[PDB]
DNA sequence: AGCTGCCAGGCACCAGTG
DNA sequence: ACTGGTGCTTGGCAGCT
């Protein structure tokens, strides 16, 4: 209603504004007007509430006024942060043209869009956490999925088979922004995820993605990257790249590759395993008391992020795991020397992303130069270490003698945060800049001489010479002496208690000082953009050096932990099996104020399922987890919390624990995934669940399930249960064996020994645990009477 | 031994070391060291080599309210000499910015005799002062959960520290603050009494010790008299239905299991219109009273006000939060809008009096009197304050014209002088011929004539230049500084007067504070009763009757929350519990409706005992002392500990609701405990119990022993799914559905087949 | 060391001569 | 159609106390 708001009824300003806002209909538009970014209509109302700024209005000759808000251009970063923390994208519009030569409103382009998965600036990101853009897509048969780390170039592609692998892939990558195709059927994977972004179907067309990705990589086809085979993934990867290009609107030279992640190249862990193993996130949501809290004492941000990627994605290549282990063993003695030097390399990876996007600030290049200064010390230290993988990483990190020198001669020791104000480029780097700097010590040299000279000539002791941004340079005299000033003194600015003047000499100095300051700032910015021109050709080798430095940090880290926390090197056997001697839960052993009871395990194709019994709090769940963490750690190359481990190949880890609406339904569908997708190479942890509607309702299914895992699938299965009935299984079924966690009953109390023993328990301790919980003794007596009745059945 | 500015910060922190210290620094308050680290964690702000964290001045009240909501006291240190000029503690705030509208905010004190416990709460806004002497650990943990103090005073030597350890706002105090002769003296002097007999607490030494410490703390925190605190009341165990934390949490009274406010009993029942009414309604929900006298009176009121709720609720809405506004009148912190709202509420009382005049109900007519009229104070504020005054009195414009002759006089002179300076602008503008000429006002120059730069050179020679701007010149003349004196001295005399007339309004209002407090409380209760009357009528509730002996007879009853939330028809169900039929063993499916049927029993009992009508065609109900709930979900240990608590503390007047006790351990162990639990509850305690179980063996109970019956729910298979029927019918169940749910989960058919075989095998020995 | 209010640079608006 | 004056976000700081 009201105001038919056709093109002609709008002002030149609003015509141009709505045109640019139409290119970004559903996200905020910062709109450059002089020294402000301004928002309008609903953008202004929302921006007012989110940014906590005033909602005002611009006047209008045609109809209703225009809602309005905005912030000074020099304060954008603070408000951009406030927005991105809440998941808001923002289009940044700048003025391109000169207002002095524009008849109407000046040309305005959107130069970039800040979205939560495409941020590369240091103040909007978290140091030790990745921030990944992603694209997902589904059709009849399966999924395609891509991730990009814009602040590094790591571009990945996968084709998860089913709902549960896709779920576990979203869990593992944890994207900050998720682009998804409009026809996505399984919204239950995607709903209530952050930075969610519905995208047209055409953005996932295969021919277009192949064209765009080959263009980006400079290849004819993607044979060389291992993804020509993989249209499902490619379609997601296409949408992803198109988004990235649209948000940055510059070339993205740091995205020179893409890699497919195949199912069989890593150990797939279902979403429950990840949570129950508490790899980077405990069950309460926080980061305390995780696997990563204990294992992660990396000394640089990029190293930490790399370690967590490895923990979340164990590899199956025997060769890569052996090399990682050797590195850990070879570098163990040189931990204390290598670590303070690696710390000084910093997050070189993210600085190089900003270099590639041309957004690198003067303190970015200073820390890049500081990193180069650490390379010869690290080359010397790694020379002595006779390990082929250690020397390959020493080669990969390079030295960059010529660039370390370039940055030392071009930038101040400690430059400002930004280049806008100057003071970044050093003396000697450019001859023209130094003769344009005849000004910085031309001022107060000259102005103090003009002050004293005119103070003495005039005889007026209050006379001083100053500058003011608005009125320029001046000669100030006090009000009480101002009636004595020369008539030559042209009057410039008046104040309450002082008059200020200008004279032909000082005006001439004002014009020249300011023209040359503008010339010195423009040249400085030309020279700083030129630093990018000379650094960028070496981008590949630099990215390789960051990666080698980050991997060094991970491995030097894992070496130190292996020593400090008493870990041993695992070996690998040809067939399924796990043989542990005196193994411990790597996390529970650290947090426990008292000694962790170490425990064995024998698992093999002959001894492939263990039924685990023992009282509540007896240590059954812990024993299972620590098996899986030891498997996990072994398959990232790391040493392991035990006296000795021998471990076969694993394809998948499955965890089924107790549980939204119907708890038995969900527990049963989670069990079905396990029975449908497990193999002879999978490790399977089955913990206690809810009962069915009746007594033996659920035990029936636990028996039938156990037997399917023993007899059909033949996976390696630990099966913790309170059902003592399942201790008869070994008798009846090949591959199945009883173990139990020990407990001494002594008098009216129970002690939990946390020690695994072969065989079933002697008894179950339900009544005992209940008595520990404070159930009246008369009730426990009655329950023990009822128990004898039930035990006389057989 | 640090920098000159940080030498002052450290000495000031020594005065209040246990409290976070805001320290003024230009446009920011700034915290240092352990204050900076703790506050960056609590408030989501940065950490800056001295640690520092800063809040901007313009949002100081928002961030004070965030810290105070997490149990933190906060000292502010303003101006160069400095001093702690303000302190907010969580349990003693009364400012609308720092308070949540619809949540109570209590100060509390706790302490321990060899004889037992002492407890005391205070709502510093309402004046509501309560004490108790819980008999043991579990009852004291129960009063702590329910009252939920924002700040808890406690003795140095408190032995039972596990009761309060995790709580926010813990304030360790000396033992001499709980000395009893000093507690009586201070309390009597606060109340104007000689003994505490009239408040019914003269013989409650443990309780008074806590209330004395509480009072001293509140006083020290305000440095004002607290005249609105004129009474104290003692809650006794017999007076209410006790509920432990687990039960309070499982019945989801005001807070759902995920910490939210949605899908709770309060979300449905609480449609009150004033914030003071909502608070009173939630106090009732969490404290069912057992005195049927009080209960019959609320019922009567709920039925008598049936045809009067459409008329009353719009009017009551406009009364607003008169309770919290009166607190600020008592503390002399009330602002012009506080007085404006008090006026608007007085403007409603005549209409409310006429509407209630016809209501045939003795309790409504007494609330109608207690409500009062206050026509003289309504006139005062009508004449004294303008229609919509500014937030603060600071800048005047709050006193109306006609109220004071002296004030009108100074305003007429200030207006006359600004009228002359407007005419001065127009006169000087024609005389010079300079169209840009105007008169502005400033702090640093006062009044001045401005002329644009381009025209400034044609300024008359009698003008004296004072400020050059980028594109203008500002001058003064003797005429300007003469009429500047005229406006400034007039506006200032009229500002000091307004301020003194404002203070005078407190002198005239406060003499009637006691009756005003009774009016706001009565208006709150009306709001509650009228809400409950609208609820009963709208939601098809009925009025329960009370019987002398334990028993719950429900006809077609429902879960009051579940029925409003889901868009599927709510199947109503019966219940007949009596001394002859004390326990029901509930069998049947998962998602079958057991937990709902148990919880609705408890909700109906709870609602009957706040005086409300109930979701049912009929409910008769005997006395209940306690409601126990062991419903939902190391977990086995926590469930056994709750089970243990029930068996120790339940009586024959208790409602006990148990769910799948036994699941977690072995079949024989779990069944053995379940059996022996049923037995105890059924034979020893004789509590009216509902025992949901999966053990079908437990259905043999009714045959073995008296007062035990089977009931069950069933399901129905059709199409490609299950239809759980949600209808409770007599007898044990004859079907399980676990295997059926596994089939629909995708568990392979061949696994199901093997389980079917194994189930028949397993059941046949029974 | 603190309060106030001009200024930053884009537009459009509006009134006063063309 | 042309001149010269108004208006509006917030952060920085000159210019007064
Ligand atoms: N082997 C161990 N040594 C020392 N403490 C242990 C060990 N295993 C478990 N615990 C402790 O026992 C507690 C309960 O163990 P849990 O595995 O959950 O028993 P269950 O699952 O059988 O009921 C854990 O909190 C852990 O701290
Ligand atoms: N009487 C009923 N009429 C309609 N819906 C019901 C009824 N009883 C329960 N429900 C709904 O069915 C769901 C599952 O039943 P539930 O209360 O959990 O019993 P159980 O312990 O057997 O699973 C509940 O979440 C509730 O919303
Ligand atoms: Mg367990
Ligand atoms: Mg239930």
Element (H, E) at A676: helix A663-677
| Distance from C-alpha of B466 to C-alpha of A181, rounded to nearest angstrom | 67
C-alpha A424 chain-centroid distance? 30
Given the DSSP bridges, would you call strands A133-138 and A108-114 parallel, antiparallel or unpaired? unpaired
Give the ligand at the shortest distance from the Cα of B591.
2
- In this structure, the protein residues whose CB atom falls closer than 7 angstroms to any atom of nucleic acid strand C are A 11-14, 33-36, 38, 59-62, 72, 95, 99, 102, 104-106, 469-470; B 24-26, 79-80, 435, 440, 442-444, 469-472
Element (H, E) at A181: strand A177-181
Residue B364: CB atoms within 10 Å: 21
Q: Does A764 contact chain B (CB < 8 Å)?
A: yes
Question: What residues of A are in contact with residue B747 (Cβ under 8 Å)?
Answer: 668, 671-672, 675, 701, 705
Q: Which two tokens stand for residue B89?
A: 């503690």
| Distance from C-alpha of B392 to C-alpha of B97, rounded to nearest angstrom | 14
**A617 CB less than 6 Å from ligand 1?**
yes
Q: Which two tokens stand for residue B531?
A: 């809400």
| Distance from C-alpha of A197 to C-alpha of A89, rounded to nearest angstrom | 10
Coil, strand or helix at B747: coil
| Distance from C-alpha of A735 to C-alpha of A733, rounded to nearest angstrom | 6
B 318-337: CB within 7 Å of strand D: none
Comparing alpha-carbon positions, the chain B residue that sits nearest to A661 is: B591
Coil, strand or helix at A582: strand
Find, among B379, B592, B324, the residue nearest to A665 by Cα.
Answer: B592
Coil, strand or helix at A770: helix
C-alpha B202 chain-centroid distance? 30
Provide, in whole angstroms, the distance separating residue B473's CA from nucleotide C7's C1': 16
Cβ distance of A779 and B676 shorter than 8 Å:
yes
| Distance from C-alpha of A404 to C-alpha of A406, rounded to nearest angstrom | 6
**Ligand 4 center from residue A661 Cα (angstroms):** 10
How many DSSP H helices and E strands does chain B contain? 26, 27
Ligand 2 atom nearest residue B559's Cα: 1
Given the DSSP bridges, would you call strands A490-494 and A498-502 parallel, antiparallel or unpaired? antiparallel
| Distance from C-alpha of A184 to C-alpha of A136, rounded to nearest angstrom | 9
A56 CB contact with strand D at below 7 Å: yes
**Nearest-neighbour CA in chain B from A189: distance (Å):** 18
How many DSSP H helices and E strands does chain A contain? 28, 27
CB B439 within 8 A of CB B449: yes
First to last CA, chain B: 83
Specify the experimental method: X-ray
Q: Crossing angle of helices B336-346/B478-509, nearest 10°?
A: 50
| Distance from C-alpha of B153 to C-alpha of B107, rounded to nearest angstrom | 8
Domains of chain B in sequence order = 1-98 (3.40.1170.10), 104-239 (3.30.420.110), 240-358+512-540 (1.10.1420.10), 374-509 (1.10.1420.10), 541-766 (3.40.50.300)
Q: Which two tokens stand for residue B691?
A: 């025992």
A418 CB contact with strand D at below 7 Å: no
Radius of gyration of chain A (CA): 35
The full DSSP string for B534-589 is HHHHHTT-B--EE-SSS-EEEEEE--TTHHHH-SS----EEEEEBTTB-EEEEE--
Cβ distance of A723 and B666 shorter than 8 Å:
yes
Strand partners for A611: A719, A738
Which DSSP symbol is given to B400?
P
Starting at the earlier edge strand, list the strands of the sheet with B552-557: B545-546, B618-621, B552-557, B573-577
Find, among B722, B721, B365, B296, the residue nearest to B546 by Cα.
Answer: B296
Provide, in whole angstroms, the distance separating residue B443's CA from nucleotide C3's C1': 10
The full DSSP string for B641-694 is HHHHHHHHH--TTEEEEEE-TTBTB-HHHHHHHHHHHHHIIIIII--EEEEE-S
Cβ distance of A617 and B640 shorter than 8 Å:
no
Find, among B341, B318, B347, B320, the residue nearest to B329 by Cα.
Answer: B341
Residues with CB under 5 A from ligand 4 (ion): B 595
Given the DSSP bridges, would you call strands B107-112 and B151-155 parallel, antiparallel or unpaired? parallel
Provide, in whole angstroms, the distance separating residue A95's CA from nucleotide D10's C1': 20
**B633 CB less than 6 Å from ligand 2?**
no
The full DSSP string for B691-721 is EE-S-GGGGGHHHHSTTEEEEE--EEEETTE
| Distance from C-alpha of A649 to C-alpha of B461, rounded to nearest angstrom | 100
B591 is in an annotated binding site: yes
Q: Does A770 contact chain B (CB < 8 Å)?
A: yes
**B615 CB less than 6 Å from ligand 2?**
no
Report the residue count for chain B. 766
A34 CB contact with strand D at below 7 Å: yes
Element (H, E) at A520: helix A504-535
Q: Which two tokens stand for residue A350?
A: 């993210």
Element (H, E) at B21: strand B20-25
CB A175 within 8 A of CB A133: yes
Residue in this structure with the two tokens 């940080």, named with its chain if needed: B6
Q: Does B555 contact chain A (CB < 8 Å)?
A: no
The full DSSP string for A371-435 is HHTTHHHHHHHHHS---HHHHHHHHHT---HHHHHHHHHHB-SS--S-STT---BPTTS-HHHHH
| Distance from C-alpha of B252 to C-alpha of B220, rounded to nearest angstrom | 37
Mutation site for B-interface testing, chosen from A192, A469, A775 by largest number of B Cβ within 10 Å? A775
Kindly provide the b/e burial profile for residues A583-592, where b requires at least 16 CB atoms within 10 angstroms of the residue's own CB: bbbbbbbeee
Mutation site for A-interface testing, chosen from B257, B672, B699 by largest number of A Cβ within 10 Å? B672
Q: Which two tokens stand for residue B17?
A: 């070391």
CB B350 within 8 A of CB B373: yes
**A637 CB less than 6 Å from ligand 1?**
no
The full DSSP string for A219-248 is -S-SGGGT-TT-HHHHHHHHHHHHHHHHHH
CB B636 within 8 A of CB B664: yes
Chains A, B: CB contacts within 8 A come to 225
Which residues lie closer than 8 Å to B477 by C-beta, 6 or more apart? B449, B462, B463, B464
Phi and psi angles of residue A295, each rounded to the nearest 5 degrees, phi first: -85, -15
Q: Crossing angle of helices A318-330/A388-396, nearest 10°?
A: 90
Cβ distance of B645 and A772 shorter than 8 Å:
no
| Distance from C-alpha of B55 to C-alpha of B72, rounded to nearest angstrom | 16
Provide, in whole angstroms, the distance separating residue B141's CA from nucleotide C15's C1': 76
Residue B353: CB atoms within 10 Å: 14
| Distance from C-alpha of B353 to C-alpha of B351, rounded to nearest angstrom | 5
Find, among A292, A304, A751, the residue nearest to A556 by Cα.
Answer: A304
Q: Which of residues 668-697 of A touch B (CB under 8 A)?
A: 668-669, 671-673, 675-676, 688, 690-697
Radius of gyration of chain B (CA): 34
| Distance from C-alpha of B275 to C-alpha of B269, rounded to nearest angstrom | 14
Residue in this structure with the two tokens 């404006």, named with its chain if needed: B340
Q: Does B644 contact chain A (CB < 8 Å)?
A: yes
A83 CB contact with strand D at below 7 Å: no
**Ligand 2 center from residue B742 Cα (angstroms):** 19
Which DSSP symbol is given to A443?
T
Which residues lie closer than 8 Å to A4 by C-beta, 6 or more apart? none
Cβ distance of A700 and B664 shorter than 8 Å:
no
Per-residue three-class SS string for B609-638? CCCCCECCCEEEECCCCEEEEECCCCHHHH
B595 is in an annotated binding site: yes
| Distance from C-alpha of B494 to C-alpha of B487, rounded to nearest angstrom | 11
- The minimal CB distance from B672 to the residues A669, A705, A767 is found for A767
A196 CB contact with strand D at below 7 Å: no
A103 CB contact with strand D at below 7 Å: no
């Amino acid at each position: 209603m009201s105001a038919i708001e056709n093109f002609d009824a709008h002002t030149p300003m609003m015509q141009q504004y709505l045109r640019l806002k139409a290119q970004h209909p559903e996200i905020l538009l910062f709109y450059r007007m002089g020294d402000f970014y301004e928002l309008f209509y609903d953008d202004a109302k929302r921006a007012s509430q989110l940014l906590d700024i005033s909602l005002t209005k611009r006047g209008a000759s045609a109809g209703e006024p225009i809602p309005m808000a905005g912030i000074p251009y020099h304060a954008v970063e603070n408000y951009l942060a406030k927005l991105v923390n809440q998941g808001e994208s923002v289009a940044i519009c700048e003025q391109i043209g000169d207002p002095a030569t524009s008849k109407g409103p000046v040309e305005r382009k959107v130069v970039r869009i800040v979205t939560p998965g495409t941020i590369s600036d240091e103040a909007l990101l978290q140091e030790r956490q990745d921030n990944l853009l992603a694209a997902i897509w589904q059709d009849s048969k399966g999924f395609g999925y891509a991730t990009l780390d814009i602040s590094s170039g790591r571009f990945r592609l996968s084709e998860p088979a089913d709902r549960e692998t896709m779920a576990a892939e979203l869990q593992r990558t944890n994207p900050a922004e998720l682009l998804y195709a409009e026809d996505f059927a399984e919204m239950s994977l995607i709903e209530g995820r952050r930075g969610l972004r519905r995208r047209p179907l055409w953005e996932f067309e295969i021919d277009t993605a192949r064209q765009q990705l080959n263009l980006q990589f400079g290849t004819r086809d993607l044979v060389g990257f291992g993804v020509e085979n993989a249209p499902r993934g490619l379609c997601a990867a296409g949408c992803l790249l198109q988004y990235a290009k649209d948000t940055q609107r510059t070339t993205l030279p740091h995205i020179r590759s893409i890699t497919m992640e195949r199912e069989q190249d890593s150990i797939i862990m279902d979403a429950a395993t990840r949570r129950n193993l508490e790899i980077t996130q405990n069950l309460a949501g926080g980061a305390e008391n995780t696997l990563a809290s204990v294992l992660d004492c990396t000394v640089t941000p990029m190293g930490s992020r790399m370690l967590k990627r490895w923990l979340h994605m164990p590899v199956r290549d025997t060769r890569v795991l052996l090399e990682r282990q050797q590195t850990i063993g070879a570098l163990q003695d040189f931990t204390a020397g290598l670590q303070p030097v690696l710390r000084q390399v910093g997050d070189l990876e993210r600085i190089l992303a900003r270099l590639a996007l041309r957004t690198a600030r003067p303190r970015d290049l200073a820390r890049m130069r500081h990193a180069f200064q650490q390379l010869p010390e690290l080359r010397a230290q790694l020379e002595t270490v006779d390990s082929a993988p250690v020397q390959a990483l020493r080669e990969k990190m390079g030295e960059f003698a010529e660039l370390r020198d370039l940055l030392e001669r071009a930038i101040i020791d400690t430059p400002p945060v930004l280049v806008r104000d100057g003071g970044v480029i050093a003396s000697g780097y450019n001859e023209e800049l130094d003769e344009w700097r005849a000004l910085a010590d031309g001022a107060t040299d000259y102005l103090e001489r003009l002050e004293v000279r005119e103070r003495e000539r005039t005889g007026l002791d209050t006379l001083k010479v100053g500058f003011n941004a608005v009125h320029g340079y001046y000669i100030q005299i006090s009000r009480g002496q101002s009636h004595l000033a020369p008539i030559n003194y042209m009057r410039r600015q008046t104040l309450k208690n002082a008059e200020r003047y200008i004279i032909p000499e000082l005006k001439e100095y004002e014009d020249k000082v300011l023209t040359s300051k503008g010339k010195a700032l423009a040249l400085e910015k030309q020279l700083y953009e030129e630093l990018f021109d000379l650094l960028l050709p070496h981008l590949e080798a630099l990215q390789q050096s960051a990666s080698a430095l980050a991997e060094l940090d991970v491995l030097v880290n894992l070496a130190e932990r292996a020593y400090t926390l008493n870990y041993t090197c695992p070996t690998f056997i040809d067939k399924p099996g796990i043989r542990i001697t005196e193994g411990r839960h790597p996390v529970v052993e650290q947090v426990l104020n008292e000694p962790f009871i170490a425990n064995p395990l024998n698992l093999s194709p002959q001894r492939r399922m263990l039924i685990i019994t023992g009282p509540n709090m007896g240590g059954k769940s812990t024993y299972m987890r620590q098996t899986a963490l030891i498997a996990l750690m072994a398959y990232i190359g790391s040493y392991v919390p035990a006296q000795k481990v021998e471990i076969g190949p694993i394809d998948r880890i499955f965890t089924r624990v107790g549980a939204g609406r119907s708890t038995f339904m969900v527990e049963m569908t989670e069990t079905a995934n396990i029975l449908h997708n497990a193999t002879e190479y999978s490790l399977v942890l089955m913990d206690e669940i809810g009962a069915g509607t009746s007594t033996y309702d659920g035990l029936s299914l636990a028996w039938a399930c156990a037997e399917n895992l023993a007899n059909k699938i033949k996976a390696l299965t630990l099966f913790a249960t309170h059902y003592f009935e399942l201790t008869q299984l070994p008798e009846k079924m090949e591959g199945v064996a009883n173990v139990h966690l020990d407990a001494l009953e002594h008098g009216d109390t129970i002690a939990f020994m946390h020690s695994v023993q072969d065989g079933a328990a002697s008894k179950s301790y339900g009544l005992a645990v209940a008595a520990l919980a404070g159930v009246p003794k008369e009730v426990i007596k009655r329950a023990r009477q009822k128990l004898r009745e039930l035990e006389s059945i057989s």
